[PDB]
Amino acid sequence: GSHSMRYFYTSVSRPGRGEPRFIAVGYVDDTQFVRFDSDAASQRMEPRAPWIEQEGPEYWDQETRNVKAQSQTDRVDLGTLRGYYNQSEDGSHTIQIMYGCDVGPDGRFLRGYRQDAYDGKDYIALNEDLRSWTAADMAAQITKRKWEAAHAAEQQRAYLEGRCVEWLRRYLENGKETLQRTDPPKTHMTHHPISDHEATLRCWALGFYPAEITLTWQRDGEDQTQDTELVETRPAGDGTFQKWAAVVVPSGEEQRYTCHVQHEGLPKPLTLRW
């Protein structure tokens, strides 16, 4: 019932002192809908989902202006942090931002996020109250003091509770056929012998949306966690996701084991046997 919008900004400095590479992506739940790439000749926020193409030129103008504005600040901060930490001129460094908002079923604001990382480590983060920051050590402490004095949190909070939520509700309406859908997983089980004494049972879940899913094993109806493997949920490349779980079993005892699939698109949880 709840839904989320998230933006992911990446600024990567290039060797020497060249202009950093900046990429932004926007997601609603597990569906990407926009991108910006400083290496593209367009230099514009671009649509990446069909239900966003209906936004007019004032939208794309404003999206493009505001992401470049962030990228130009991140580019300067990369230079400053490089000098702050004495990081050699031959070396690449990264500023990342994740931010966005969650809405409930009624479309009301639930929670908001705005957090930054430098070189893969937490740098500064807006706390859940949207009024205070958690900052790392050293340079980020200067940032936290600077942002407190500038009342940045008030401005970030206004975005997260206001425009962020307003526009997520609009995307959820305009892309409702895509975003409010649930595709249940298509499930099957395979059998892979490994010796005369043992065999691997693999439980498959394919073509599901959203990505959240739970696969578990049981033996004789008791939870089975030993000798089990679980792959990271992975994208099929068509808007749906894949996952499998496996267990190594003694030859002849395959029928003691069951696989259990929990997913929002299933009327009730599934059980599979070999």
Partner: protein
């Protein structure tokens, strides 16, 4: 500073059927920094037309990318993904297994 080596999965979009067109996927995730080299291989040679998703990252800041190309699996042709990253001493090869 905090660098992370990539996880790699090689797989197909749809269950493989010899003779039917499909997509070969190489999903790289859990890595940092974001610069990475990913090639899809057919019988040891680089496939020339490969597309990839837009760079994104997870809550833990690590990056992920899906590299994909059209292919037709056969009983004899061998497919793989070749990944190199600053955290990898040498390129890592993960062979496509239709059972995974």
């Amino acid at each position: 500073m905090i660098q992370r080596t990539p996880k790699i999965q090689v797989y197909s979009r749809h269950p493989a059927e010899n003779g039917k067109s499909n997509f070969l996927n190489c999903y790289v995730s859990g890595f940092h920094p974001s610069d990475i080299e990913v090639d899809l291989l057919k019988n040891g040679e680089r496939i020339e037309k490969v597309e990839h998703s837009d760079l994104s990252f997870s809550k833990d800041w690590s990056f992920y990318l899906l590299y994909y190309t059209e292919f037709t699996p056969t009983e004899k042709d061998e497919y793989a993904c070749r990944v190199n990253h600053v955290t990898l001493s040498q390129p890592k090869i993960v062979k496509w297994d239709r059972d995974m």
